Design a protein around this ligand. Structure first.
Ligand SMILES: Nc1ncnc2c1ncn2[C@@H]1O[C@H](COP(=O)(O)O)[C@@H](O)[C@H]1O
Length: 278
């Protein structure tokens, strides 16, 4: 029942429909309500997301399906990463590494329950009140139901693969991480092919050794330029220690099956030094 929620105040339009903040008069807490525009099992699917209870995941508190309208009630977070990086240019390396750890930790929690995000970006990395706590929003919604979307999309998707795996989210994490360090997007494409080009420009053009099966993907072009790769070292090696570089490189393997897992990323030596807040 939506009648529980008062002072419902529109915040803007999201991916799925209108987004609001509200007061939950049963708990006194502020919540976010997301109107999910449909028309084209869904309630079951979305309801399973309620089990994703983790400090680095925006909690799905309630699914309300009434008068043939669908609202999701979520935990409220006052800030998000894009806004936060805009407002905080001098933010420390320690905050950046904490945000990264926290993102990977959330992601690993979800992947371990067979839940993929598929559309990670700084805009759904919400921040809640020394360091804010990073909480990922909208896990599982891309499934269950603007050029910026492209910037965090992995090459297997851009090349037209039908198989989304956990590796998709790992790619996106690496892109977000690079952006936090560089203050501009790593691969700021303006089309799916321009996007691939931006990726190939840094990482090199794949072949059937570096990425077995790549040339059979639907949108592969035998005419792609034979990019050698600027290399990540050259692009951002100045901003990152050697350990950080090795992690980032592992997350940006172009073949999704070679891309590091969230779990192995959390085990990487980069996070063994107590120089961040989990
Ligand atoms: N859980 C949340 N808590 C607070 N604000 C949110 C939440 N999710 C999305 N928003 C805000 O709602 C608007 C649309 O969200 P987005 O889906 O990022 O386009 C933006 O103003 C976001 O800042």
């Amino acid at each position: 029942s939506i009648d529980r929620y008062r002072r419902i105040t529109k915040l803007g339009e999201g991916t799925y429909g209108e987004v609001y903040k509200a007061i939950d008069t049963v708990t006194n807490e502020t919540v976010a309500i997301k109107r999910i525009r449909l028309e084209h099992t869904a309630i079951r699917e979305v309801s399973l997301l309620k089990e994703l209870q983790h400090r680095n995941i925006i909690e799905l508190k309630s699914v309300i399906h009434h008068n043939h309208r669908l609202h999701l009630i979520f935990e409220y977070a006052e800030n998000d990463l894009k806004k936060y990086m805009d407002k905080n240019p001098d933010v420390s390396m320690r905050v950046i590494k904490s945000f990264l750890y926290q993102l990977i930790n959330g992601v690993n929690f979800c992947h371990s329950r067979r839940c993929l995000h598929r559309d990670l970006k700084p805009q759904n990395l919400l921040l809640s009140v020394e360091t804010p706590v990073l909480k990922i929003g909208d896990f599982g919604l891309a499934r269950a139901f603007e050029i910026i979307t492209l910037w965090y999309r992995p090459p297997e998707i851009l090349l037209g693969s039908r198989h989304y795996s956990t590796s998709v989210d790992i790619w996106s994490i690496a892109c977000i991480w690079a952006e936090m360090l560089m203050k501009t997007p790593l691969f700021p494409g303006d089309s799916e092919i321009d996007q691939l080009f931006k990726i190939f420009e840094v990482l090199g053009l794949p072949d059937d050794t570096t990425w077995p099966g790549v040339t059979a993907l639907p949108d592969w072009k035998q005419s792609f330029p034979k990019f050698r790769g600027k290399t990540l070292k050259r692009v951002l090696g100045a901003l990152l220690d050697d350990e950080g570089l090795d992690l980032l490189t592992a997350m940006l393997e172009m073949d999704p099956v070679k891309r590091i897992s969230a779990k192995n990323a959390l085990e990487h030596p980069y996070f063994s030094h107590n120089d961040f807040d989990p």
